[PDB]
């Protein structure tokens, strides 16, 4: 639950030279985005998650 | 064999499609030594603060461009803390890894040089008159060359055939080089040691080189292909020295 | 490296555009030994008449398709002599080789996953309903996703968002699975061994796995190039093993 | 400076099959040419060039 | 691996997409040796003057080609020293690199056949008639197949489907042969050795082989692509011999 005292950074992206095609082929596209963890990785002190819930039993 | 990558401090670039690299005369940048060394006083190197790619910004190759350049240093002293470690030093040195990118599909076509010319001296557009600092260089930005003569006070005479130099430009390939060709490649590395008669100087008063990128055959496409088509470059200092430390100058 | 042909009986598959292999979670198929065997009948293993590779129905890629399913078993339950094995016995277990076909010329584009998923249990489009065994399988035929929010009785709630499953779909890549980039392969391959908590089960009451095809980029093109572009389907059994032969059952 | 005595001969182009190209790639297109010497070259007799020239002296 | 350099006398050729080569059948050319000898005089041997590359005029392949043919040599007969060393001659003996020349884009479709046929005897377009010289040969000029029967005198029957020689065109596949599909590669080669049934012979009396070039797939293309694609021929002699010297002949 980060707060401004352990804040980690942005990132950007930009064009470094932009996008060329030939005659004949569609002029816009698309890219894709994929996340991972490292070897380097881990966590501690367990708890519950907010993203479940229920208002009464039988769910 | 047409994969390559290159870190340097917290920067990493690929390419897919690189043809090799240029070594400027099989001369790999380093620092200076003790049997040829003139000042006294002991230098700071950062080492990786300085060492990392930095972006300058893109232009955009149309169907009539008759090229670009830059002049370095002087286009990297607003990058970060190379450009701070230049505003508080007298002396520095440095060598430059530079990579160029523009990628196109394989329905268009057209050819770049990119050239790197170490102590390029400019003429005047007025036969008896002299350039101003601004008509040589505009930091990140580029200048442009024309396509006929030019006129203007204290501006550099800008037809590409002459370069800006008086030469013939067909003949640049005397100095380091490579070509983008947009059917075999699409990008273009040179790295490039200190050269200088001096082993060091001031960054801000001395131009070292002009980075030049000239189309030779246009940019060329047919019906409904893509239009913008830009061009970037993306420079690393290698081997960075400073001495001579005092307080921070102002232009 | 891009090549590859794969053989099972009397059958055979080349390749020109491949990337790889998936083996599930690198282990092959294989028959069930004795120290892991409850079922004390001797079993038949057909060996050449069962592991091969038939193909099932096409579906064609429009420039709006959410995507599609198959269950297995139950989409070979119609093919030749694995299928009559499945008829006439209690028990069976097979593992898998997929093989997922698409072509495309180098002036198009689009990008579909390619995923496995063991014990996909579906829920309705009414919360308080149950669903029907035709809203799960229609055999041999595909069942087509939805964009939007689904209705009517018995069922599948069918928008692509949720995988039927109330899931993130970008998620579903902790399953076995591989992508088709249309600038990069043709095809994809999965080998999937025999995943259950018991050693054998029934091949009628039980789905197995769940084949999904989702395109993430759509489908683009322009002028005059081809419109049609059809996806096909190729899976053979390995290893497979029947138990329990009495009179055959009937639907 | 070449005479009738030294000559050399000439160089030549020709189209051996044709240029093909599919639809929506542009139909003409350009040759470069680059010049050099091998490594059983070599000059003699020193003399001034005639291609740079003054009228008078500060020039 | 696709990449390939030949060089003969002062000739080069060059290229980077060809498939291999064709030996025709397994023998390279070579000299005619003492017990395979009948004729008695010392005989010549010009070696470089002979053995080289000369390249023939190109044709236009169209949209609606049937094909076309040279016949050797006498194709080679006004090419510098070889027909001139042709000419004052009895006796000759050489075999040969053939080397044929078609590229395209990648957005062109078509196949040729190129097929090299020693003896190809030719039937005339009058059942009880024969064949003049001229309609077998107009030297570096080819002839032109058609595309339905043929009528006229002293003329050769000249539809594509029988080759002009009474056989269905498909089987011309036993002969030394390759491919050019558009494709794949842009050029053919075929080296063929001197093959006859007598150890020398005169070289204006018989034809000793029929080059042919047939389309099977026909050149086809899309919106604006290049109209205009050539073929081109280019025949080296090897193993050059003569014998007989007496004053030049005349046609």
New interface residues.
């Given amino acids: 639950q980060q707060d401004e005292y352990t804040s980690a950074g942005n990132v950007t992206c930009?064009?470094?030279?932009?996008?060329?095609?030939?005659?004949?082929?569609?002029?816009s596209?698309?890219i894709?985005c994929?996340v991972s963890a490292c070897n380097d990785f881990s966590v501690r002190l367990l708890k519950d998650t907010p993203f479940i819930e229920q208002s009464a039993l039988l769910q | 064999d047409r994969v390559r990558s290159i870190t340097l401090g917290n920067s990493t670039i690929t390419t897919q499609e690189s043809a090799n690299v240029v070594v400027a005369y099989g001369r790999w940048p380093e620092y200076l030594k003790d049997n040829e060394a003139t000042a006294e006083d002991q230098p700071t190197q950062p080492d990786v603060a300085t060492c990392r790619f930095y972006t300058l910004e893109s232009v955009t190759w149309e169907r009539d461009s008759p090229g670009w350049w830059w002049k370095f240093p002087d286009a990297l002293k607003d990058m970060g803390l190379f450009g701070q470690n230049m505003y508080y030093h007298y002396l520095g040195r440095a060598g430059y890894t530079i990579h160029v990118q523009c990628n196109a599909s394989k329905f268009h076509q057209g050819c770049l040089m990119v050239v790197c010319v170490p102590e390029a001296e400019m003429g005047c557009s007025q036969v008896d008159g002299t350039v101003n600092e601004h008509s040589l260089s505009e930091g990140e930005t580029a200048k442009k060359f024309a396509s006929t003569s030019t006129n203007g006070t204290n501006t550099v005479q800008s037809i590409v055939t002459n370069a800006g130099m008086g030469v013939g430009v067909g003949n640049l390939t005397i100095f380091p080089h490579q070509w983008i060709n947009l059917r075999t490649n699409n990008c273009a590395t040179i790295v490039m040691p200190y050269i200088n008669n001096v082993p060091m100087d001031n960054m801000f008063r001395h131009h070292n080189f002009t980075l030049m990128i000239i189309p030779f055959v246009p940019l060329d496409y047919s019906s409904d292909s893509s239009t913008y088509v830009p061009i970037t470059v993306t420079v690393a200092p290698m081997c960075a020295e400073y001495n001579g430390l005092r307080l921070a100058t102002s232009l």
């Fill in positions: 930009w064009y470094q030279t932009g996008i060329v095609v030939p005659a004949g082929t569609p002029t596209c698309s894709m994929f």
